[PDB]
Design a protein around this nucleic acid. Structure first.
Ligand SMILES: Nc1nc2c(ncn2[C@@H]2O[C@H](COP(=O)(O)O[C@@H]3[C@H](O)[C@@H](COP(=O)(O)OP(=O)(O)OP(=O)(O)O)O[C@H]3n3cnc4c(=O)[nH]c(N)nc43)[C@@H](O)[C@H]2O)c(=O)[nH]1
Ligand SMILES: Nc1nc2c(ncn2[C@@H]2O[C@H](COP(=O)(O)O[C@@H]3[C@H](O)[C@@H](COP(=O)(O)OP(=O)(O)OP(=O)(O)O)O[C@H]3n3cnc4c(=O)[nH]c(N)nc43)[C@@H](O)[C@H]2O)c(=O)[nH]1
Ligand code: MG
Ligand code: MG
Ligand code: MG
Ligand code: MG
Ligand code: ZN
Ligand code: ZN
Lengths: 337, 353
DNA sequence: ATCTGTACATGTACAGAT
DNA sequence: ATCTGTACATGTACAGAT
DNA sequence: ATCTGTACATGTACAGAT
DNA sequence: ATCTGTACATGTACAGAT
């Protein structure tokens, strides 16, 4: 049932191999061509594919080109929590200016590639990414995400975030908060605003997700945490393909929701493979409550509400609410298309 | 009962403070002196190990263990006749004067280390501290501090190799069902340590033989000992794993101070035994505080079985039997067996002394 | 003037004290 | 139940060296 | 400073066992 | 129908060499 849907969603070794070989060539070449104001940049693979929760096909890859910058002063962009003003001379560090040159370089280098069919997607404003379209006969997008790496204490807006104490614990949390934090040129001084990114932390969580250290290891018990994330991701993807009303929603909304549910139900036994249906259903119920109450706090930045009126209109939330409720109460017909 | 014994065993903030201030001064000073221009041990780094740093030191803060570890790149090991734990180490390198052809003499290096320490201790005139007479079979330079209370510090010379652990340890550290594969892989990516075995057993290659140490790994385990990541943390449930270790440690210490028949036994025997029991019973719920008696009792039963069958494998080095006929005579094991059995069946009268 | 090994600055888990 | 000392990990300032 | 080599975790694929 | 064991594949951390 849901088992058979997961069968459909499961990526194939063949496609994984063919997608990765081509993606690695291109990324490797871009990374080499920086190191240039971006000399010192380092590769950090992030998102679904590297978290092992990519569904349906290996067709979207996320990579951070992160740059150590010496200590910086952050000023919070009117109390939003996530957005800040912060070699680099000819870039207050303007996100747009830095991104533009990064982008310019990438585009130049992509022209030189003659063994891969690969172009650079038209810039979407409010995106920190330089997005590559690779046409291995299969279509593959690669987001190249410029990031500043700061080694200081995380900003105070994150003090109450990452509430993993009863789940992953205080030692894990303390160690995670000793890692650097990332600023990505997502814009909101609109064109000089950077946004916090904790993709590195999210990756660790995805791959170290149990209360027991052996969760999902070879001498441990399998849980259904990732399978639930997959299923919820598929529901949204399927709905989004059908209904343009849902343009405003994205997989990060689902990922954030499940982070909260993983905190609510920390016990591995609450995510038993035998309870896949219960688990998926409680995840749906939780997501509906986020929509109803117009509240889905960033896991790392509690005061940043991803479901505020400002980012998503009430009508969109009500639309998605009715569509989820329908699928839930009719055996998820959309999983069969 | 056992709760009240643990109350007795509990160290005091006052004593901890006074012991540590004095110990840290001395160690700090020794570490700085190893870093002189001339010194063959320049580059040595401090690593605090053992009970005190594991929070299983009992009764008083009067014994401290510190490793002065030295990175030794490009090192070749030969196992000393299939014993698992013992190795010859091989290669103006600072260690010139310790080489015998390509063989690194443990006793030569230890002697100079020792000589330096002794010199430096003479210069300290604000702490009453001497160097203990060298005990054969020991890798340690042992400091006797009168604070006024008596405090020993073992300064343990160690070679640090960053390569993959020796094959004798391949099947060791069997934490897969307890701490897991990721923890084990990460632990085995840390360096391994060689300390001078240095005894005067008249044997071949004595004085060039070194022994493995995994005190760094043992420390991590002691302080990250649950199957759940929250074991013993502020948003988790307390277990009685450490409390059992303490109680077993106390039994041995008490018996050892009374009976010279037990000279051959040491706290490392009980630490190794409990490592095996922690592997046997990996679930935190098998170490519930409410079940302290059961848990301690099963630990005793396990240890008795080790004695009876003359078998207690090193946790890291499975083929190395700490309870072999060599090392420990049958009679000693049978003596300790009867003493443990007695205490167990008569309310542990020795806990009341 | 720049660089750097050493010491300090900051933060928190663990466990004892209150 | 809260508070507090020690240990320990990571970042950074700077006198003395280059 | 970069690069390769090694080891093992996280996946998928599929046959034989349960 | 699921589970277990083996093979086959990719990602990733870090040591030692260059
Ligand atoms: N891959 C993808 N792309 C999506 C999704 N919805 C919309 N898009 C495309 O993105 C642009 C830009 O619009 P945003 O709303 O800014 O989209 C971002 C981000 O692209 C998506 C998630 O993308 P991802 O690849 O990072 O996600 P993974 O975790 O790898 O999972 P995947 O399997 O789906 O790839 O979410 C939006 N977003 C908002 N805030 C964040 C944030 O803090 N982090 C991240 N990582 N993403 C965030 C649109 O024009 C559209 O074309 C979608 O579900 N997936
Ligand atoms: N502290 C101590 N000292 C003891 C014990 N039994 C005997 N001794 C004294 O040690 C020497 C003789 O040397 P060994 O027989 O080699 O004794 C070693 C080692 O000293 C002890 C354990 O001591 P520790 O300080 O390392 O122990 P902790 O884990 O910190 O616990 P603690 O509370 O008791 O201090 O065991 C012997 N040993 C054999 N094999 C090993 C090994 O692989 N590692 C370690 N660490 N020790 C090992 C004489 O002076 C004698 O009187 C004893 O129980 N405790
Ligand atoms: Mg993605
Ligand atoms: Mg993306
Ligand atoms: Mg000790
Ligand atoms: Mg000792
Ligand atoms: Zn799991
Ligand atoms: Zn515990």
């Amino acid at each position: 049932k849901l088992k058979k849907v997961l069968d459909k969603l499961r990526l194939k070794r063949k496609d994984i191999s063919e997608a990765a070989e081509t993606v690695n060539k291109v990324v490797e070449r871009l990374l080499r061509r920086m190191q240039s104001e971006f000399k010192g940049v380092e590769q950090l693979n992030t998102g679904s594919y590297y978290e092992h929760v990519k569904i349906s096909a290996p067709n979207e890859f996320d990579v951070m080109f992160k740059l150590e910058v010496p200590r910086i002063e952050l000023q919070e962009y009117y109390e939003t929590g996530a957005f800040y003003l912060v070699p680099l001379s000819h870039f207050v560090l303007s996100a747009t200016k830095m991104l533009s040159k990064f982008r310019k370089i990438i585009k130049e280098e992509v022209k030189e590639i003659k063994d891969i069919d690969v172009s650079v997607e038209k810039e979407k404003p409010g995106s920190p990414a330089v997005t590559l379209l690779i046409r291995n006969p299969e279509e593959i997008s690669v987001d190249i995400i410029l990031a500043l790496e700061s080694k200081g204490s995380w900003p105070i807006s994150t003090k109450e975030g990452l509430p993993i104490q009863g789940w992953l614990g205080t030692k894990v949390r303390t160690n995670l908060r000793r890692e650097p934090f990332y600023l990505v040129p997502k814009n909101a001084f609109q064109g000089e605003t950077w946004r916090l990114s904790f993709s590195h932390t999210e990756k660790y969580i995805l791959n170290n997700h149990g209360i027991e250290k052996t969760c999902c290891e070879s001498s441990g018990a399998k849980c259904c945490r990732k399978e639930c994330l997959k299923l919820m991701k598929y529901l949204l993807e399927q709905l989004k393909k059908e209904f343009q009303e849902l343009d405003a929603f994205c997989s990060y909304h689902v990922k954030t929701a499940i982070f909260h549910m993983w905190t609510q139900d920390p016990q591995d036994s609450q995510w038993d493979p035998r309870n896949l249906s219960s688990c998926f259903d409680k995840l749906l119920a939780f997501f509906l409550e986020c929509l109803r109450t117009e509240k889905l706090d960033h896991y790392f930045i509690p005061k940043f509400n991803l479901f505020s009126q400002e980012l998503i209109d009430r009508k969109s939330k009500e639309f998605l609410s009715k569509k989820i409720e329908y699928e839930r109460n009719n055996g998820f017909p959309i999983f069969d298309k």
